[PDB]
Amino acid sequence: PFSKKQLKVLTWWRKASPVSDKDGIICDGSIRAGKTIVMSFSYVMWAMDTFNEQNFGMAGKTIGALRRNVITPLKRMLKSRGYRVKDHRADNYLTITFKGKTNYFYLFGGKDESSQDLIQGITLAGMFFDEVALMPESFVNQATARCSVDGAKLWFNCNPAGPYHWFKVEYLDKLDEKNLLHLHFTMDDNLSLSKQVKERYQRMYKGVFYQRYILGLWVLAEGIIYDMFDQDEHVVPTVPRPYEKYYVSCDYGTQNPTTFGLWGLYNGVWYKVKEYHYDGRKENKQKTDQEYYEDLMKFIEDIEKHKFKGVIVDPSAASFIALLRQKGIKVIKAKNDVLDGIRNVATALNKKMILYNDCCKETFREYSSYVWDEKAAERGEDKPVKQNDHQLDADRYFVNTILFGN
């Protein structure tokens, strides 16, 4: 059952609509708001109805994310309303056919400055951007320039960043200058969610991430990053427990500190059992891959080897990963996306999915000093100041790699 706002997304482009003159539409706001599915479905509906034998673009942060977030569920919905879809998996495009009409839908990723160059020779009757605020402005300009065919429209879907972000200042604050519609969504616009489910999603977020992902507000990131960390709630005594499973998580440094964290599952909660912290700068003696391999074996001497499920390491420590696999130790590549990892660590703390033994003392010193970069925020980037973060980067790899899936 669709809300009034959802129906506006489905109908704005029709001849009967007063706003069909507009060059495009922007939908922003909270998570779980039911905006992504109707936006992608209305995009296809619009394109099949208005053109034939034409090319259309669809882009996300990565192709993988676009398929997971948009394309997979869009195909299920299109099939149920009688659209026929041939997915060209290796070529990354779709052929869609409906009431004797046929159009083609090419899939893109937008990651950086190089992204604009990736395709400059295709010609398009339209462009759809999922998670536009995580894309480089350069890519969005390149792709808009390829929309040369007459009657072409631009479609934008996102959640908020901060208020100096290029998409907020150049697009949302210049609506009439670009001739765009704007609709803003919260969870009240998704009628398929009960009041009990909405409250469970609310409790995943506090502070800045609550303001962005629940209230749908473009608010500045400022000061202490993990301002929900609370020594009355998140710290427990250093005592033996009957853990069912273990991992180690690592932040590799030679000219900087290396760290390990031992993590143990027990009654549906992952515990940071203890921490390793070697500062090579302060000791006046740097360490080799071999020496860190040795220290890691000492660090895990006392655990049942059948319960130890491997080391989580960043791909940039490729030499270290090679030595570990040579010695028979399992290795898991860290999902290292910074802003996502930070958001998920905060959610883990908010729901007490993780807890810390009181021996993790360097980790706690970092929790009270890790801050957002104020200068970057005023330029529209959300970035941590890269200091006092060697335990916390490893904790982030653990949370983002093991506790969070899709």
Numbering used by the authors: 13 to 418
What does the paper say about this structure?
Subsequent soaking of these crystals in cryo-protectant containing a high concentration of NaCl resulted in a transition from R32 to C2 crystal form (Crystal form 2) with each of the ATPase domains of the three subunits related by the crystallographic 3-fold axis adopting a unique stable position. The final α-helix (α6) of the nuclease domain is followed by an ordered extended C-terminal loop or ‘arm’ proximal to the ATPase active site that contains a bound sulphate ion, which was present in the crystallization condition. Initial attempts to produce diffracting crystals of ligand-bound complexes of the full-length protein failed, despite thermofluor data showing stabilization of the protein in the presence of magnesium ions and either ATP-γ-S or ADP (ΔTm of 7.8 and 2.3 respectively), Inspection of the structure containing bound sulphate ion in the ATPase active site showed that in crystal form 2, the C-terminal arm of the nuclease domain occludes the ATPase active site and likely requires significant reorganization to accommodate an ATP analogue. The C-terminal arm, residues 418–427 of the nuclease domain, lies close to the ATPase active site and thus may play a role in ATP binding and/or hydrolysis. Indeed, closer analysis reveals that this ordered extended turn contributes to the active site through an arginine residue (R421) at the tip of the C-terminal arm, that is in proximity to the sulphate ion bound in the active site. Additionally, the carbonyl oxygen of the preceding residue, L420, formed a hydrogen bonding interaction with R44 of the P-loop of the lid subdomain. Superposition of the structures for the full-length protein and the truncated protein (with bound sulphate or ATP-γ-S, respectively) positions R421 close to the α-phosphate of the ATP-γ-S. ATP bound in the monomer active site cannot be hydrolyzed without the participation of the trans- arginine finger from an adjacent subunit in the assembled pentamer, which requires significant rotation of the nuclease domain with respect to the ATPase domain. This monomer conformation is stabilized, or ‘locked’, by the C-terminal arm.
Most dsDNA bacteriophages and viruses utilize a powerful DNA translocation motor to package their unit-length genome into a preformed procapsid. A central component of the motor, large terminase, consists of an N-terminal adenosine triphosphatase (ATPase) domain comprising ASCE (Additional Strand Catalytic glutamate) and lid subdomains, and a C-terminal nuclease domain, connected by a short linker sequence. While both domains are involved in interaction with DNA DNA translocation is powered by the ASCE subdomain using energy released coinciding with ATP hydrolysis. The nuclease domain is responsible for cleavage of the genomic DNA concatemer at both the initiation and completion stages of viral DNA packaging.
